[PDB]
Amino acid sequence: QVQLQESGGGLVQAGGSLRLSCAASGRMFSINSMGWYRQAPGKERELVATISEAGTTTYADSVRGRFTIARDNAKNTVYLQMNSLNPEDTAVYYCNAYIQLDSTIWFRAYWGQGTQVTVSS
Amino acid sequence: QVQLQESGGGLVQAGGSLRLSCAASGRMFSINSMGWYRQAPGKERELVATISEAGTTTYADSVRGRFTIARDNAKNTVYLQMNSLNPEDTAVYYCNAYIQLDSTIWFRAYWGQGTQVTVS
Amino acid sequence: RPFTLPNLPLSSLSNSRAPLPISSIGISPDNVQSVQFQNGRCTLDGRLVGTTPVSLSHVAKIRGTSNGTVINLTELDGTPFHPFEGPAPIGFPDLGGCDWHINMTQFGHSSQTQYDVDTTPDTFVPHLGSIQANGIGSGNYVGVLSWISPPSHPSGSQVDLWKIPNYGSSITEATHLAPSVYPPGFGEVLVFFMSKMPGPGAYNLPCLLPQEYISHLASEQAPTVGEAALLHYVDPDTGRNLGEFKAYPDGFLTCVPNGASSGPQQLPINGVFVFVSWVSRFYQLKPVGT
Amino acid sequence: RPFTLPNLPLSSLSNSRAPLPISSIGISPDNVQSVQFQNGRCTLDGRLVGTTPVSLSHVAKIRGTSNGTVINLTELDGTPFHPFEGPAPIGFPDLGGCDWHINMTQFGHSSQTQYDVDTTPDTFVPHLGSIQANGIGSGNYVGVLSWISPPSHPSGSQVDLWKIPNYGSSITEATHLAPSVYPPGFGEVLVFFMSKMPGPGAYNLPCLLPQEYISHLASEQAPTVGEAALLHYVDPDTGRNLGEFKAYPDGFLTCVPNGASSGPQQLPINGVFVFVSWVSRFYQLKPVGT
Ligand SMILES: C[C@@H]1O[C@@H](O[C@H]2[C@H](O[C@H]3[C@H](O)[C@@H](O)[C@@H](O)O[C@@H]3CO)O[C@H](CO)[C@H](O)[C@@H]2O)[C@@H](O)[C@H](O)[C@@H]1O
Ligand SMILES: C[C@@H]1O[C@@H](O[C@H]2[C@H](O[C@H]3[C@H](O)[C@@H](O)[C@@H](O)O[C@@H]3CO)O[C@H](CO)[C@H](O)[C@@H]2O)[C@@H](O)[C@H](O)[C@@H]1O
């Protein structure tokens, strides 16, 4: 099975920093983009940042300049460092990856279990 | 061939009368609705009156009460009696008919050649 | 070559007047005493008739170039259509008694467009290679029939899929139609293969042969030795004969129903037509129902 | 029963992965070293494989009920789809490497709707009978693939019709796909039947067998006597042999091209594949081109 295992997150004061990490494991033929999404209760899931396999990064408007996404291709791991956190960043953060199971088959989006990030004031 | 031949029309003083007639000929299996259309300078072709084979009549708003459409199924001829003609009735008038060529075939719209009606 | 029909159940086969699965066996209403379908026409020795194509991928499809005013038709492969060799390009829809809604796509462009076809106006002249564009912008398109609705003219007419359109003439002979098919007599009625057609009604599209029969016959090209082919409609799980039918050389099947509420329409569609032997055209069938 | 292929020119036949006429013979790019198409899969003795139907009227089609959020799939005749017997209902589209645009119609209602299908999201689980509605309002629909466009994910990917979609799993085996087809080697490459597919590009959809071959094989059910069937591609007007091919029992053809600029791709499509004899799988073919 494809498995996404995330770690990090937790409680931080407003203005503080936090780091997220996510590892992709299992039998797979190819991995394309890896990214981070977030969803607060009652709201819809939204993009935070993605990074392609070449290293090209895209960020959401609300987090550009504050968050940093990184990736280690040899370990199939994506990282998110979040700086200058404010209470509107409180959400469940989800790891995301587009993985090709076999050479004959197209890509599929896989998701991690979810890690809570809470920014108090 | 299936053909629609119109007769009548011409010039009349305002308030006068005119009759138009249209005969369908040729090998055909059935005729559904028959009607009259007209097109005035600068305008598009528009409905004047139609009459079904049962005799049901529909008229345009502009001619209701003044024009009368009639039909003789035995001769496959449709008639338009135009009374109280005014200058807005000046147009080329077309006969129209939905005809079935054969029992296996759907309807097709056929038109007459077009006859001028001029109200001075 | 001995004559054969495909060893496949009707429920897995397709209509030949639109790309639709077969859902029932039917007979025509009593006031329908002949049909002149131009698609789904193949003789028993494999001669395509009318606008019938070999493959379902050509069935109820159009191809042509719009200039904003008219769509000038070609054959589906882009080859020019030759007028006065048939009533329309191969595969052109033959559903009379309705308005057509054709899904138009293009090679090399995005998007689809619903093309609404009234078959009654004088601009509808497929036999001369031209039909009204009715708002379809300039370009080359391929369209497939998608759904149907009550005919626009005469206003208030019911849908009547037993008819074919007028392909654009004031004389029957000018359009070179495939000839009509008649019930042969002596209680025999024509057998039709029905398909549910989408649209704002309970539309059932009849055809004379499943499309897979047509490509089979066109490929086999078996000499028609007899005046009529005696068929059995067989349940493939038990092998039992559910009724005798006759296929005639012109490419249609008949049966003696002995009832429209208890006859071929009530047969299951999971059965297979099996050729039994050549018989006389006057061979008297056993009735299907009671 | 002697093995046969339909006596019909390729140009009159249909793709088996979409209802499209065949326009060319093709071979795969060098970086395509196996395919796993789920439609257009039939054995030489007539066993349907994957989600392949008998008739083109089932090909690249969907049926299901939307609730505004998901479309719960059934088989095309409306009977329930049972998960874990195949990757999807019979006839479900198998085009990987693109977005789908499915024309949705309904029985008893007017209008058509374009249904846009991303095959990558976690909601795309056809093997469990459910796919995202993506704005399709509540109702029962039948849909057929109409056109395709570049895939939404990964963003900027080119269309790649040599792939199939992921039918909704994190383990390959969970979806019970038909097995992959490999070129046998020793200069033999797989032969594909190409169709032009509408959309904003020069899209060519490959398949392993024309749909009319599939319904023929399913009907004939000829015992596969040999390890391979030696075929001739014959011009029907002259009878001349344009090249030798091998059909393998799993339901695919091969040839030795001796060139991608001079080989089967340059053959005309007005030809007919004719069975010659059963041969060993080690039979060495003469190259098609120079
Ligand atoms: C929904 C449209 O269907 C076709 O137009 C048909 C026309 O539809 C009318 C509906 O019947 C009516 O309820 C209302 O919505 O107006 C619609 C538009 O006129 O009905 C006539 C018969 O009266 C014909 O069947 C038309 O083909 C289609 O052509 C339109 O583009 C719409 O999809
Ligand atoms: C025309 C639309 O096609 C599908 O959307 C595809 C999307 O199309 C975009 C065009 O490429 C772009 O030039 C502009 O027109 O916006 C369109 C809509 O976003 O392109 C993506 C790839 O980048 C996919 O191929 C989409 O399928 C269809 O889903 C839409 O409904 C439109 O018909």
Residue numbers in the entry:
A (entry chain C): 1 to 121
B (entry chain D): 1 to 120
C (entry chain B), D (entry chain A): 229 to 518
Paper text:
Direct hydrogen bonds as well as electrostatic and hydrophobic interactions were observed. All binding residues, except one (Asp102), were located on the P2 subdomain. Alternatively, the aggregated VLPs had a reduced number of 2′FL binding sites, and the concentration of 2′FL relative to the remaining available binding sites was higher.
We showed that the Nanobodies bound on the side (Nano-7 and Nano-62) and top (Nano-94) of the capsid-protruding (P) domain using X-ray crystallography. The S domain forms the scaffold surrounding the RNA, while the surface-exposed P domains, which are further subdivided in P1 and P2 subdomains, contain the main determinants of antigenicity and host binding epitopes. Norovirus interaction with cofactor histo-blood group antigens (HBGAs) is important for infection (e.g., GI.1, GII.4, GII.10, and GII.17), although certain genotypes poorly bind HBGAs (e.g., GII.1).
